[PDB]
Amino acid sequence: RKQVSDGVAHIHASFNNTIVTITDRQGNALGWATAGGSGFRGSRKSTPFAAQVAAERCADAVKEYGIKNLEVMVKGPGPGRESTIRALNAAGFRITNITDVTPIPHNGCRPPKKRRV
């Protein structure tokens, strides 16, 4: 609909899932897509292939605004940390800046108990 061209690619890659959100330089959401929403579950959900198809679906629902250049921002671990960025460049984008924004406390909150498995 409107024009933007330069934006920000935001990705929340967690051990369970990967959320791909395409936003502008200010922080306003343009469009999004996730691995869970892509039509995968459990095991298939937390794979780099699912993170690949999420970036593919995301680029489609946003090219109506007409984006050409975007600076990637990586949050958290798990698969889809790299496979998202790859599926993004090969889809038709100029990657300006890749940044890791994984939240790291300076010893604050007590984390949950260790899983006895």
Partner: protein, 151 residues
């Protein structure tokens, strides 16, 4: 094949045109150890294929095999309990070995009158890349390009 690093058996070339690649194909179509009734179906499907495509019996098979020839395949590997498909690039000798195998097996699943017809029409459907033989390469391409991260 743990310690023993073996080579490969170099089977005698074809009695007709002299190609070793065809001598492999006849051994693929051969069943119950009958070489006399195996090469007889392969030459009858070569004669009927070149006649209804425009001669060149050496090259009319070369058009049908390049389409069914794979470039990448997957290998099932249990790393941490889970089975991960690893994409591995196939060797030039094994490239044709699978391409020939998908022609014989797709023609076997056909409903034609004879194997001379089943094979000749399969080599015709693979030269235009619109059959069971080219699809087995297509599904092998979709599975290799999906697991492209664990390369």
């Amino acid at each position: 094949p743990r310690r023993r690093v073996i080579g490969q058996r170099k089977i005698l070339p074809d009695p007709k045109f002299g190609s070793e690649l065809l001598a492999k194909f006849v051994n693929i179509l051969m069943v119950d150890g009958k070489k006399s009734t195996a090469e007889s179906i392969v030459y009858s499907a070569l004669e009927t294929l070149a006649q209804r495509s425009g001669k060149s019996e050496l090259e009319a098979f070369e058009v049908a095999l390049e389409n069914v020839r794979p470039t990448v395949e997957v290998k099932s590997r249990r790393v941490g309990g889970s089975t991960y498909q690893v994409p591995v690039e196939v060797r030039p000798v094994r490239r044709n070995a699978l391409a020939m195998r998908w022609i014989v097996e797709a023609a076997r699943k056909r409903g034609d009158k004879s194997m001379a017809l089943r094979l000749a029409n399969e080599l015709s459907d693979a030269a235009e890349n619109k059959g069971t033989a080219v699809k087995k390469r297509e599904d092998v391409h979709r599975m290799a390009e999906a697991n492209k991260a664990f390369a």
